Short mmCIF file of C-alpha atoms and ligand atoms in Angstrom, two decimals:
data_model
loop_
_atom_site.label_atom_id
_atom_site.label_comp_id
_atom_site.label_asym_id
_atom_site.label_seq_id
_atom_site.Cartn_x
_atom_site.Cartn_y
_atom_site.Cartn_z
CA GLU A 1 37.33 -68.42 52.66
CA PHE A 2 33.87 -68.62 50.63
CA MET A 3 34.66 -65.09 49.74
CA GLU A 4 37.65 -65.94 47.40
CA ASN A 5 35.68 -68.47 45.06
CA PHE A 6 34.65 -64.73 43.59
CA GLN A 7 37.05 -62.92 42.19
CA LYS A 8 35.92 -59.82 43.88
CA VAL A 9 32.87 -58.47 46.29
CA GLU A 10 31.47 -55.05 47.36
CA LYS A 11 28.49 -53.38 49.24
CA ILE A 12 25.46 -52.97 48.11
CA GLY A 13 23.61 -51.95 51.52
CA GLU A 14 21.81 -54.20 54.62
CA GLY A 15 19.14 -56.58 53.74
CA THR A 16 16.63 -57.60 56.01
CA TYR A 17 18.75 -60.24 57.03
CA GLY A 18 22.11 -60.17 56.75
CA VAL A 19 24.71 -57.60 53.62
CA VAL A 20 24.35 -57.81 50.34
CA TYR A 21 27.33 -58.19 48.05
CA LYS A 22 27.62 -57.13 44.47
CA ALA A 23 30.19 -60.29 43.64
CA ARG A 24 31.93 -62.11 40.37
CA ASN A 25 32.00 -66.16 39.66
CA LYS A 26 35.12 -66.75 38.65
CA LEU A 27 34.00 -70.31 37.44
CA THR A 28 31.96 -68.34 35.23
CA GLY A 29 32.27 -64.12 35.37
CA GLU A 30 29.31 -63.16 36.60
CA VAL A 31 28.17 -60.98 38.36
CA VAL A 32 25.83 -61.87 41.01
CA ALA A 33 24.13 -60.57 44.72
CA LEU A 34 25.90 -62.33 47.28
CA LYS A 35 22.78 -62.13 50.37
CA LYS A 36 24.74 -63.32 53.89
CA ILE A 37 22.81 -64.58 56.45
CA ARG A 38 23.24 -65.12 59.86
CA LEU A 39 22.42 -67.30 62.72
CA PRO A 40 18.67 -75.17 60.60
CA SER A 41 18.30 -77.73 58.43
CA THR A 42 14.40 -77.03 57.45
CA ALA A 43 15.25 -73.15 56.84
CA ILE A 44 17.82 -74.74 54.36
CA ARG A 45 15.58 -77.34 52.23
CA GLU A 46 12.98 -75.26 52.31
CA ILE A 47 15.61 -71.88 50.63
CA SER A 48 16.91 -74.55 48.23
CA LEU A 49 13.74 -76.17 46.93
CA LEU A 50 13.18 -72.33 45.60
CA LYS A 51 16.24 -72.46 42.88
CA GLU A 52 13.40 -74.18 40.79
CA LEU A 53 10.91 -71.30 40.80
CA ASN A 54 12.22 -70.09 37.65
CA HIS A 55 10.32 -67.08 36.30
CA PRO A 56 11.47 -63.80 34.75
CA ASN A 57 10.08 -61.64 37.32
CA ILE A 58 12.07 -63.52 39.69
CA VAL A 59 15.13 -62.45 39.85
CA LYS A 60 16.93 -66.36 39.58
CA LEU A 61 18.27 -67.46 42.77
CA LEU A 62 21.25 -68.69 41.08
CA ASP A 63 23.00 -71.08 44.59
CA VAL A 64 22.21 -71.28 48.72
CA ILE A 65 24.67 -72.07 50.66
CA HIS A 66 25.71 -73.56 53.79
CA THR A 67 29.56 -73.02 55.22
CA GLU A 68 31.34 -72.46 58.55
CA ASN A 69 27.50 -72.44 60.84
CA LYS A 70 26.81 -68.97 57.91
CA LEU A 71 23.98 -69.37 54.82
CA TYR A 72 24.81 -67.70 51.41
CA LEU A 73 22.48 -66.88 48.93
CA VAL A 74 23.39 -65.96 45.28
CA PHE A 75 20.89 -64.58 43.28
CA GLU A 76 20.87 -62.85 39.64
CA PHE A 77 22.33 -59.18 39.65
CA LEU A 78 19.95 -55.96 38.89
CA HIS A 79 21.70 -52.32 38.95
CA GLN A 80 18.44 -50.47 40.57
CA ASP A 81 15.39 -51.39 43.19
CA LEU A 82 12.54 -49.07 42.80
CA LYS A 83 12.89 -47.38 45.84
CA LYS A 84 16.17 -45.09 43.67
CA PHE A 85 13.77 -45.73 41.43
CA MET A 86 11.16 -44.23 43.19
CA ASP A 87 13.43 -41.70 44.59
CA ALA A 88 14.89 -40.22 41.80
CA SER A 89 11.17 -39.71 39.76
CA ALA A 90 9.70 -37.53 42.28
CA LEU A 91 9.89 -34.26 40.80
CA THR A 92 7.74 -35.61 37.96
CA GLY A 93 6.69 -39.47 39.04
CA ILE A 94 6.96 -42.53 37.16
CA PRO A 95 4.93 -42.17 33.96
CA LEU A 96 1.44 -44.10 33.71
CA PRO A 97 2.62 -46.32 30.99
CA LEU A 98 5.50 -47.64 33.32
CA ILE A 99 3.86 -48.17 36.69
CA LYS A 100 1.53 -50.47 34.31
CA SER A 101 3.88 -52.77 32.79
CA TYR A 102 5.88 -52.71 36.45
CA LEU A 103 2.25 -53.65 38.10
CA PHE A 104 1.87 -56.17 35.13
CA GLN A 105 4.65 -57.74 35.15
CA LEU A 106 4.71 -58.06 39.24
CA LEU A 107 1.10 -59.91 39.07
CA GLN A 108 2.80 -61.59 36.39
CA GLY A 109 5.84 -63.22 38.55
CA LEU A 110 3.08 -63.87 41.54
CA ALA A 111 0.56 -65.35 39.52
CA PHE A 112 3.78 -67.96 39.12
CA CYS A 113 4.47 -67.90 42.28
CA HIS A 114 1.09 -68.26 44.07
CA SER A 115 0.71 -70.94 41.54
CA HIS A 116 3.81 -72.85 42.28
CA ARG A 117 1.36 -72.06 46.48
CA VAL A 118 4.77 -69.62 47.18
CA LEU A 119 4.10 -66.53 48.95
CA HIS A 120 6.23 -63.86 49.32
CA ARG A 121 5.21 -62.09 52.10
CA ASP A 122 7.40 -59.23 52.56
CA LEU A 123 6.47 -56.44 49.45
CA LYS A 124 8.06 -53.31 49.61
CA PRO A 125 9.38 -51.95 46.84
CA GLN A 126 13.32 -51.97 48.10
CA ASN A 127 12.72 -55.72 47.10
CA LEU A 128 11.00 -54.93 43.80
CA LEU A 129 14.05 -55.03 41.80
CA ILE A 130 14.70 -53.76 36.97
CA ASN A 131 16.91 -53.29 34.27
CA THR A 132 17.44 -51.04 31.74
CA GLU A 133 14.92 -53.24 29.89
CA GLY A 134 12.13 -52.43 31.37
CA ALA A 135 11.59 -55.26 33.10
CA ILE A 136 11.12 -55.80 37.11
CA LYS A 137 11.90 -58.41 39.17
CA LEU A 138 11.03 -59.34 42.44
CA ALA A 139 13.45 -60.04 44.55
CA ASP A 140 13.48 -62.14 47.75
CA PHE A 141 10.60 -64.28 47.55
CA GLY A 142 9.57 -67.84 49.78
CA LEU A 143 13.10 -66.42 52.81
CA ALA A 144 9.73 -64.76 55.37
CA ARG A 145 8.36 -68.35 55.23
CA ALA A 146 12.42 -69.64 56.04
CA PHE A 147 14.14 -66.97 58.59
CA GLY A 148 10.21 -65.33 59.37
CA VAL A 149 10.27 -61.23 59.17
CA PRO A 150 11.71 -59.38 62.62
CA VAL A 151 10.81 -56.00 64.24
CA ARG A 152 14.31 -55.77 63.19
CA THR A 153 17.08 -55.86 60.87
CA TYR A 154 20.81 -57.35 61.98
CA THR A 155 21.66 -53.89 61.78
CA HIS A 156 18.86 -53.14 63.93
CA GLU A 157 17.16 -51.01 61.54
CA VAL A 158 13.07 -51.40 61.54
CA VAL A 159 11.50 -53.51 59.03
CA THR A 160 8.89 -51.42 57.01
CA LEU A 161 5.61 -52.42 58.62
CA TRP A 162 4.14 -50.12 55.24
CA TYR A 163 3.51 -52.88 52.71
CA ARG A 164 1.68 -55.82 55.90
CA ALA A 165 -1.69 -56.39 55.19
CA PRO A 166 -4.77 -55.70 57.75
CA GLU A 167 -5.31 -59.74 58.11
CA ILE A 168 -1.41 -59.88 59.58
CA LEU A 169 -1.93 -56.64 61.25
CA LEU A 170 -4.70 -58.28 63.51
CA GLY A 171 -2.75 -61.68 64.41
CA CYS A 172 -3.62 -64.72 61.86
CA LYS A 173 -1.71 -66.89 61.99
CA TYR A 174 -2.49 -68.80 58.80
CA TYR A 175 -0.77 -66.63 55.55
CA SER A 176 -2.80 -66.89 51.60
CA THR A 177 -0.90 -65.68 48.62
CA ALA A 178 -3.68 -62.43 49.35
CA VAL A 179 -1.24 -60.87 51.62
CA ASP A 180 0.95 -60.46 48.43
CA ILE A 181 -2.12 -58.58 46.19
CA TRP A 182 -2.31 -56.04 49.61
CA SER A 183 1.20 -55.67 49.24
CA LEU A 184 1.63 -54.49 45.61
CA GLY A 185 -1.81 -52.66 45.67
CA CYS A 186 0.21 -50.28 48.33
CA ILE A 187 2.96 -50.22 45.88
CA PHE A 188 0.54 -49.26 42.36
CA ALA A 189 -1.03 -46.67 45.04
CA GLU A 190 2.74 -45.43 46.16
CA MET A 191 3.78 -45.13 42.17
CA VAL A 192 1.01 -43.19 41.22
CA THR A 193 0.68 -40.66 43.62
CA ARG A 194 4.32 -40.82 44.67
CA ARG A 195 3.37 -40.94 48.63
CA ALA A 196 3.17 -43.57 50.14
CA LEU A 197 0.11 -45.15 51.13
CA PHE A 198 -0.14 -46.83 54.76
CA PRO A 199 3.30 -45.26 56.58
CA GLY A 200 2.74 -46.12 59.66
CA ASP A 201 5.82 -46.02 61.98
CA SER A 202 3.74 -48.70 64.41
CA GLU A 203 1.16 -51.85 64.65
CA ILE A 204 -1.35 -49.77 66.03
CA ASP A 205 -0.39 -46.42 63.51
CA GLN A 206 -0.34 -48.82 60.33
CA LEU A 207 -4.09 -50.23 60.84
CA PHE A 208 -5.13 -47.24 62.10
CA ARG A 209 -4.27 -45.71 58.54
CA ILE A 210 -5.39 -48.03 56.79
CA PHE A 211 -9.02 -47.50 58.74
CA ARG A 212 -8.82 -44.21 58.02
CA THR A 213 -8.27 -44.34 54.63
CA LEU A 214 -10.55 -47.71 53.99
CA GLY A 215 -13.09 -47.83 57.29
CA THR A 216 -12.41 -48.97 60.26
CA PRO A 217 -13.78 -52.96 59.73
CA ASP A 218 -16.09 -54.61 60.65
CA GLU A 219 -18.35 -57.84 60.32
CA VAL A 220 -20.07 -56.82 57.28
CA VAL A 221 -17.73 -56.18 55.41
CA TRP A 222 -15.33 -59.07 56.88
CA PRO A 223 -17.09 -61.83 58.38
CA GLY A 224 -14.67 -62.73 61.33
CA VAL A 225 -13.00 -60.41 61.59
CA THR A 226 -14.22 -59.61 65.32
CA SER A 227 -12.71 -62.57 66.25
CA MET A 228 -9.34 -62.12 65.28
CA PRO A 229 -6.13 -62.03 67.96
CA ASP A 230 -5.59 -58.21 68.12
CA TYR A 231 -8.89 -56.71 67.10
CA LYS A 232 -10.15 -54.64 69.73
CA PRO A 233 -13.93 -53.73 69.97
CA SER A 234 -12.83 -49.64 70.80
CA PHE A 235 -11.43 -49.45 67.86
CA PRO A 236 -12.57 -46.65 66.57
CA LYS A 237 -14.66 -46.33 64.10
CA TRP A 238 -13.34 -44.53 60.74
CA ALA A 239 -15.57 -44.21 57.95
CA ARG A 240 -14.19 -45.35 54.07
CA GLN A 241 -12.54 -42.81 51.61
CA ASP A 242 -13.87 -42.55 48.23
CA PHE A 243 -10.70 -43.90 45.59
CA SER A 244 -10.43 -40.44 43.14
CA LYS A 245 -9.56 -39.34 46.96
CA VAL A 246 -6.52 -41.47 48.03
CA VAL A 247 -5.22 -41.81 44.03
CA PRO A 248 -5.47 -39.14 41.78
CA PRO A 249 -4.66 -38.59 39.62
CA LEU A 250 -5.82 -42.75 38.53
CA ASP A 251 -8.15 -43.53 36.07
CA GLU A 252 -11.51 -45.67 36.48
CA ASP A 253 -10.21 -48.56 35.90
CA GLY A 254 -6.63 -47.73 38.25
CA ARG A 255 -8.77 -47.22 41.18
CA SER A 256 -11.22 -50.71 40.04
CA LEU A 257 -8.37 -52.76 40.64
CA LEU A 258 -6.78 -51.08 43.21
CA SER A 259 -10.23 -51.15 45.39
CA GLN A 260 -9.81 -54.65 44.44
CA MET A 261 -6.35 -55.26 45.50
CA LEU A 262 -7.14 -53.96 49.18
CA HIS A 263 -10.86 -55.34 50.34
CA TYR A 264 -9.54 -55.97 54.31
CA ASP A 265 -11.17 -60.08 53.15
CA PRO A 266 -8.89 -61.57 52.03
CA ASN A 267 -11.03 -64.81 50.66
CA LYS A 268 -12.31 -61.32 48.16
CA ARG A 269 -9.00 -59.71 47.39
CA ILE A 270 -8.74 -60.59 43.67
CA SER A 271 -5.86 -62.67 42.57
CA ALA A 272 -2.69 -62.35 40.92
CA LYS A 273 -4.45 -64.41 37.57
CA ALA A 274 -7.82 -62.86 37.71
CA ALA A 275 -5.66 -59.15 37.72
CA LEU A 276 -3.93 -59.46 34.78
CA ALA A 277 -7.57 -59.89 33.18
CA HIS A 278 -8.27 -56.56 34.81
CA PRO A 279 -9.38 -53.88 31.84
CA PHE A 280 -7.00 -52.07 33.73
CA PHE A 281 -4.28 -53.65 31.14
CA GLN A 282 -5.89 -54.18 28.04
CA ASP A 283 -3.47 -51.22 26.82
CA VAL A 284 -0.50 -52.26 28.50
CA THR A 285 3.12 -51.90 26.63
CA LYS A 286 6.65 -52.76 27.60
CA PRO A 287 7.71 -48.95 28.53
CA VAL A 288 12.65 -48.09 28.50
CA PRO A 289 13.03 -47.06 31.76
CA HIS A 290 15.43 -43.28 31.89
CA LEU A 291 17.65 -45.42 34.66
CA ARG A 292 21.39 -43.58 35.94
CA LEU A 293 24.44 -45.97 36.68
BR1 HH8 B 1 21.30 -57.18 43.13
C1 HH8 B 1 19.88 -56.72 45.07
C2 HH8 B 1 19.86 -55.16 45.67
C3 HH8 B 1 19.90 -55.75 46.79
N1 HH8 B 1 19.04 -56.78 47.44
C4 HH8 B 1 18.15 -57.77 46.26
N2 HH8 B 1 17.62 -58.97 47.14
C5 HH8 B 1 18.19 -59.77 46.49
C6 HH8 B 1 18.50 -60.08 45.01
C7 HH8 B 1 19.43 -58.79 44.58
C8 HH8 B 1 19.29 -57.15 45.35
#
């Protein structure tokens, strides 16, 4: 009966966890994103707590509905995701000032959630949503704690590894907020170069692409790494590349920030809060993007 206290309902696409619909609420007339999650009470409690986790760079969670043994998440509707926008921007690139504005807003969103001890764990361009007024917002915060992150979606589509922090790939049991900083660093590099930084197609391909760029990690740069569940002494030993080669034509400030976002040691990785104070953002602005809706 649920899709009846919506005036109507059409299909935006296929989420990690279920189908995503565009729908209108009949009481309010508001246009929302409705996500079906297919199948647990602990998840219900934790996801309901995210209704309070409100920030202008976090996609608003309007309602959590458990009915007929199905879960529906009701979110703020935004017209476009950063994946589509980057694909639309492929011939020209996103202008640097807009890249800087989006990174700045995304760090404010991360700083807010992290301050409340909530992490994302699965940041990717597809869950960064943009509006006509130059805002960017993080979608699906705190869901990964609730439902985990599967190898495959409900439609068996492969869940992307491209943004996964090395601690996760090496089998670390405990996530820290540093996993989100790693993901956002990967997205920053992709906005600048118009190519994914580490487009792995398996867990080992993902790790070896990271190794070939940043060097094979060792006890020098990452104390304890040789004791991680999935670390092998037999890993090939690649040398580190200069960031000047990895993200041209990013300036010294941006390369400095990106380097701190991609430190192997999660402890050494820059926080969201300290990243907001980085000299890269001294001249930050809020440009209006060119959106075709
Ligand atoms: Br609008 C929209 C589109 C796609 N995925 C989304 N995920 C969360 C909230 C809004 C979304």
